[PDB]
């Protein structure tokens, strides 16, 4: 069998409370969070059940993906390597370990289904530049996979279950909000297809689920002076309610693939704050995490990228 590195990339999460400072310092481009912000972040991680389970999920996704890929075909033996953006093991650490282990050929995938120049493209550029610095190693990189039918089907089935679980009047008066992580609006000056891909995710999921009333929103924007992609899910929820009085809101943060603060808090608390305030029911179906259906979707994405 041909041996191939499987480079699984993701944002990264702190591994313990004491990593919060350095993690967010990395996110803030060297700017250490002020003490009140550090304390608030600790409170938030404690409120959603703790950091450790969150940090486990990328590991489980990569290892299940490796094993499942090695099981469903017989030509390639994959070895998974995790490269993270904002905490060790960094992308360059992962590429360097692949080089050390004798890997000469690798396929990479970012655990984010939509391409953007800010995230996926930069992950891929960092991996490929480390590989070319070290030499003797090439990487073929998945760039987007939001339209993989098995992944669409994951979210379609979750949405169908959520709508079927509703009371009749909720089911008749509900709103589906499909969201991804906001980015600076300036990405549009490069023709970044990220917004169009999020809209396409929302179209495909709503269509598959039979949900005719849905909206596209953004979440987790930063505070840079430049405008970020909007509307934010909080404002969009309040605004849609003020237009049409929906009694239930279903949040599908399709841009995220795992439980993390920006879902468990930014949706299950902040959006929940808004729905509770307007008297609407809140629903947020399970994130893919390392569930077998999602891992099979990722394995299909990888094998298709390799033309197998
Ligand atoms: C950490 C992280 C995740 C998971 C994600 O989707 N995004 C973004 O879009 C940014 C900008 C960052 C950071 N992250
Ligand atoms: Mg301790
Ligand atoms: Mg494509
Ligand atoms: Mg926020
Ligand atoms: Zn980032
Ligand atoms: Zn591992
Ligand atoms: Zn399997
Ligand atoms: Zn070397
Ligand atoms: Zn739109
Ligand atoms: Zn963020």
UniProtKB/Swiss-Prot annotation:
E.C. number: 4.99.1.9
Binding site for Mg(2+): 18, 44, 266, 270
Noted pH dependence of activity: Optimum pH is 7.2 with Zn(2+) and protoporphyrin IX as substrates.
Keywords: Cytoplasm, Heme biosynthesis, Iron, Lyase, Magnesium, Metal-binding, Porphyrin biosynthesis
Subcellular location: Cytoplasm
GO cellular component, one term: cytoplasm
Protein name: Coproporphyrin III ferrochelatase
Organism of origin: Bacillus subtilis (strain 168)
